[PDB]
Symmetry: D2
Subunit: 220 residues, 4 copies
């Protein structure tokens, strides 16, 4: 069902700081290698008045390299697919939510996305477009109430060299009965490969890899 | 331009726990008295699988009784209007956001609303519809960076007794330059006065009054 | 009843904020059924304090609360044995403070044994640069949870220049014995520093608190 | 260098959780460059503890971290003068703990002066009911802010029954002298109770901690 190469099509409807916008994307990736590339176009609301980086992790954990010894919640859930829900709590009290309904037809994933951003300070690094990238990260994956949660401490690198923190809490909900994983980690590195001046066109890459801890247990 | 009686029309497009919905409403109230009634209809996604109460405060601070010694940020901004943004952090990590763009044509307010709910536990009081009402509340109003913030500790009274807590942080953003208020309070009491079985049809009322502290300064 | 219309207060606080250890002693008195009280506070170790004194003030007793008769008073009925309370204070710039208080009584005197810890205040923030003027008056939401009484309050420091710096308080109040619990209600506050010396080595502090239900009628 | 291949540890903690005062002494030793250590802890007042001991364990020194040559070691650099740390621990059911530790050195021994406060734990929650099995292994995000080092980590307690109970840690580590500051990096941990007596009056405690950059390469 999940092919070695899969295409992607998406549509995000968003509001941030009261500015409405729509973004469409198309791309492709390699689910079993945990890599993917998307081409994103702002089709309504351009140019965006806020840092593009707040959006980029909203643009599918099917694209994760899972070792054989950890259950792959994400690839098991197709063709039926899954949705996810996320809260993003920034350290200056900007709060974003997003939801994404993920389906499959043929060799293509489709995502139907909403994004809301609230309460960003006008002089803060989001509304002043002071961000450079997300740092790579490690997301903690755990089962709760029969679905999978993933929490990650994310940080934007800023112009100037400091960081701006955001706490992600995501719940990933399979539309079929899959084998559930044990507690584990997904290491990520998301990167904008290219963009025009106002980020109306963006080329976006993510590498993600699941694992257990590298440290052995002593209490055994 | 804000009349003694104003009408209201609204539209909400919402998603909670992945469930999309659309609610339309109409009503009216008395802005200088701080009271209003709305009639709300679920037009898509009926029946809602969650507690209707999580939406009700999202269905306009123009409907507030302001004494003359507190600047009224809300009434000053019309006819151009204002927009607001809110986060609602529940104690069990459900997080909702909402935005509303509020305009006026004649004797009628219009609201264009989004609502997103994330990460509600499936056996919690929201997804199990165990809520009875919001308690009345006291919102704290303070100026920040030229606009008006209001924060309020909210609580849902639950079936069975006990409360479920939610922290609201709102930013209200005037579309023209207004006189800003000093720190103050808005007391509220919101109530669903009638509903049908599945809350497809709701009649909703709010009373809100602004004030300084009732305690004198030493 | 052992809560007399006039009661005295004695307290000791051991604290640490931003790594700086300190000890504060206080003595005072108030009128419990009226909701008013006065304290004289002296820093006995770690002076001068490197942070805004206002972070400490609400930790220096809900026994000093005016309770209308239709609202159950959780607090006075806990005595003579008393009660303890535990509090988290989460500031908007990620400073987080905890405090605990054990409140006992002998004769016409309350005694408080207090701890305070402050973590992660930004070095240029209004706490460590002492930019605060006062707390604003407040409304605390009181609700039963798990057989004890919780109170949550959105607090705000007025700062030099008229902006505010927000703090969310979450307190649990726990009677040493079983007592009748209240319905949901509110406690309004106004806390004020009446006098201080330049480094806040000596502070005179006042509070007024009054419980109520909502003044708005119900439909 | 004053940091020897093997260092001893002595510590005193004064704490309060849920109204319950206690004092815990400890002694042990570790290998700072290997990132490993063992402590033996003894409750000297307030025994037996009425709460899950796990809440205390990460408060019982990042000098014990294996740092690679390409990441600056904030912690080793700050001795003999030492450092202090400040920590908030926010649990998902509104329990909030703080801790502070002052870390000094004489000869081949570290000394820690520790406070711990725990507030607002629910009485039927897993803390007060002693339902915790262990912390999961974790990945702490390390970043400089205002000339000192912060570390944030998403922690989880494994519970009886197999679910997890989340806690968000925010730490600030503050050197007592000038040191070379590191770039953004990670510290992987695995903390374990190796042995304990019936009421946890005596506990033998191990940590392994290792600093790293991300394992994933950049496409930028």
């Amino acid at each position: 069902v999940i092919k070695p190469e899969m295409k992607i099509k998406l549509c995000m409807r968003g509001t941030v700081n009261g500015h409405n916008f729509v973004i469409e994307g198309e791309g492709k990736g390699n689910p079993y290698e945990g890599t993917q590339i998307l081409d994103l176009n702002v089709t309504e609301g351009a140019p965006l008045p806020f840092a593009y980086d707040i959006l980029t992790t909203v643009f599918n954990r099917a694209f994760t390299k899972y070792p054989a010894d950890i259950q792959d919640y994400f690839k098991q859930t197709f063709p039926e697919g899954y949705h996810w829900e996320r809260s993003m709590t920034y350290e200056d009290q900007g709060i974003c939510t997003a939801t994404s309904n993920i389906s499959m037809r043929g060799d293509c994933f489709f995502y139907d996305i909403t994004f809301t951003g609230t309460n960003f300070p006008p002089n803060g690094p989001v509304m002043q477009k002071k961000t450079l990238k997300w740092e790579p990260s490690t997301e903690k994956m755990y089962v709760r109430d029969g679905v999978l949660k993933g929490d990650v401490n994310m940080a934007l690198l800023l112009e100037g060299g400091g960081h701006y923190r955001c706490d992600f809490k995501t719940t990933y909900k399979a539309k079929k009965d899959v084998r559930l994983p044990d507690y584990h980690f997904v290491d990520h590195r998301i990167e904008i490969l290219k963009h025009d001046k106002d980020y109306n066109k963006v080329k976006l890459y993510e590498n993600a890899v699941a694992r257990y801890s590298m440290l052995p247990s002593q209490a055994k």
